[PDB]
Structure formats: structure tokens, C-alpha cells
Symmetry: C2
């Protein structure tokens, strides 16, 4: 059943048109010929049906129990999205050169956060499609609940890691409505750390109910 909000270490196998596209197995990543030089592998810690992952796996994680695995089939409606017509627009040649780009069929461009694909350069105006690569297609998914965590101190720690990979270890210290985080002496030097902290905060609050204050204690010592 897995209540809404309880942290789960899930692990996913993602197929589309038979070919595998997304997963958490690095050894399987080589053996399929796809690898992200940025993504972190192993059981991805997510929250119970809080809309963290795809809505289809989201409802499926709810149905599932700790340890249980299945071949979940996700319709495009409940997976990546049904291909919106209005998301196919014809953007002029100006708004194109205005971004230092010659319109090239196939080449993809971004307008206002939303990226998109040049379909055909119609002498004058350009046809661009703003739908996700995997929109409309149906995904065969294989998800397993690797473990569940339900002890505040630890939950916090996982969040911290979910946001800053480099932060494998930290002292948490719950004192009723407060969550003390004592970060390693290298922490204050992480590029864009304050941002993280103030995001790490959000989540700790947004999820952990017996928490109304988050604290980051940084230390400096001389050599």
C-alpha cells in the first residue's frame, strides 16, 4: 500500500519501442550503449507518490509493497504526455536569427525555457515542434522498491544527498520542529551551496511533518 509521503528507494528499468532508454544499473548502461556522464545510478530515493517520478510509476509505487517488482505498462497520457497540437507552432525567421542560429531542419532550438525541434524550413517561416521526445509513445517500465526509509534523521540525510551528491555524510540533530544539519568542513566551498541549502530546506519542511526550522552549521578552521 505504501502511504503517501514515505521515502522509498525505488529502482527503474525503462523501455520504449523495445529499446531500453532509462535505468539505474550502471553495468547495464554499458551493456545497452547509453550512459549519462552526469546522472547518478543505484536506487533513486524518491517520495511516495508525491509526483516525484512519472505519474504512472507514481500510482504503481502506491499499489506496490516493499520488495515487490512488476512490468508496469504506461499510456502516453499517464507517462510523458499526449502530443499537443498547439505545441506545434510556426515561428518566424527573425526570432530565429535573433538567437544567433540559422534555421536547420533537424536541429533543435529553445524559445523561452521550452526547447523544441525544427521540422521544416518553409521559405520564410519555420515550423517548430515543442513536444518531449518520448511524448505519444508508450513506455514499458520495470520498477522495484529496493527499500523504504521512515526515520526522520535518516530521511533528512537522503534529501541532502538528493541535492548535493558530494554530501554523503552529515550530522542531523532533531530537537522538535528543528533539524540541525552539521556539514563537513569543505561544504561552504561547494559552488552554489547557499542555493542548495535553501532548497534542501524546502524539501525537509515540505515533507517531514515534525519540522518547522532547518539549520546549517558551517565551520572554518585554519591550517
Amino acid at each position: 500500500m505504501v502511504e503517501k509521503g514515505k521515502m522509498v528507494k525505488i529502482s527503474y528499468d525503462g523501455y520504449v519501442d523495445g529499446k531500453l532508454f532509462d535505468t539505474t544499473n550502471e553495468e547495464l548502461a554499458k551493456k545497452e550503449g547509453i550512459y549519462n556522464p552526469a546522472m547518478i545510478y543505484g536506487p533513486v530515493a524518491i517520495f511516495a507518490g508525491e509526483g516525484q517520478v512519472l505519474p504512472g510509476l507514481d500510482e504503481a509505487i502506491l499499489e506496490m509493497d516493499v520488495g515487490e517488482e512488476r512490468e508496469v505498462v504506461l499510456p502516453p497520457e499517464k507517462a510523458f504526455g499526449k502530443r499537443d497540437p498547439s505545441k506545434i507552432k510556426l515561428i518566424p525567421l527573425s526570432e530565429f536569427t535573433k538567437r544567433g542560429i540559422k534555421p536547420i531542419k533537424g536541429l533543435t532550438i529553445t524559445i523561452d525555457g521550452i526547447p523544441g525541434k525544427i521540422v521544416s524550413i518553409n521559405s520564410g517561416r519555420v515550423l517548430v515542434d515543442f513536444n518531449h521526445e518520448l511524448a505519444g509513445k508508450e513506455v514499458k517500465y520495470r520498477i522495484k522498491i529496493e527499500e523504504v526509509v521512515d526515520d526522520k534523521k535518516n530521511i533528512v540525510k537522503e534529501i541532502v544527498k538528493m541535492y548535493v551528491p558530494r554530501l554523503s555524510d552529515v550530522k542531523v540533530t532533531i530537537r522538535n520542529g528543528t533539524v540541525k544539519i552539521e556539514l563537513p568542513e569543505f561544504a561552504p566551498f561547494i559552488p552554489n551551496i547557499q542555493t542548495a541549502k535553501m532548497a534542501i530546506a524546502n524539501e525537509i519542511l515540505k515533507r517531514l511533518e515534525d519540522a518547522e526550522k532547518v539549520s546549517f552549521v558551517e565551520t572554518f578552521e585554519r591550517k
Copy 2:
């Protein structure tokens, strides 16, 4: 006598060629026709002869005692600097256009941190002088020791302020070799804060002897 290292709230009147050039009196700033839209006025907290201010006032603060004032006269050797010949160099026209600037007599330019003044555009090469405006001249100074602070908790606080004006209030909490700084809830949002903190640290250590660890405790709460 004022021992080396004890924090002092000094206040300065600075004359050069009769005209007043530097001071801590905002009301006198208008009444003389010079004002920095950035500088903060009132007794500037500095450390006892640690080379914080001009070496001349530095040795004079040592001679002086709390409350005492004088008309200290500073030679260019012990004030701003004696005008170095080698600091007058002839930089080529390339290194000039290479910085998007047409060489103009009077206009000042910077090369490698060190700013300097275009003296004469000698058809081909440019004569540039890299000496501080007030170098060579002699300064008439009027300095008064407004107060002295010698209690750790408080000393810390002044440093914090010396670095981040916005931080008028903070909880310090000395626990033997450690200095706990508890910063207001807006602190983590100050632009370039980590930098400050890690600088604030330095000083706290560099000065306060019974301190080997500095700590910054930031907090986040939701609205």
C-alpha cells in the same frame, strides 16, 4: 600605550594641501563638498597597529591612549608612499587598444590590477604613471580614539559588521576555541555571503587568540 591587537574605534580627520580629503563625519562631508555614496561613516573599528590603517596613524594609535586626540603629521614615506620611478612606464599602443580604449591624456587606465594615469600620448608609445593620487604629498591628520573594545563576544560582532554592514546584530557564543555565530534569517540570502563568512572567519582567528574554530548557523523557516 594601547597593546598591539586590541580593537579600537578610531575616528579620523584627513587634510592634504590644506583641503580635507578623508573623514568619518557625515555632517562634515557635506560641509566640505566630498562624499562617497558607498563609504560608511562614524568611528571606524580597527585593530591596534596591525597595519589596518596608514602606518603613520598606526604608530600614532600605539602612542595614544583611549580618549586622546592629536594633530599627527605624516611624511609621504610613512603615509601613502614615496613616488617610485620604475612605476613610471611607457606602455605601447597595442596593449592599449587591446583593452578597448583610445589613449587619452588625463584619462586613467588599469593594467594588471594596478590602475594608472596616462600622462602624454607620445605618437606611438604612451607614458603612464602608476602611483597613488596622494603619493609624495604629506598629510595632516587628526585622529581620536573614540573607544576601545576588549571583550571577545563583542569583538567578534564588530568584525562581522566590518565585513557585512547589513549584519548589525548576531548571537555570538564562545565555547573555548570556538565562536558560534547565529545569523539573522535573512543572512543566507545576502549576495556573496559564503565569501564574507569565510573571510569573517579568517579575521576572528587571525586576531582573537582563544579561538580555533568559527561557526555559521543559518536557519530557514516557511511562511
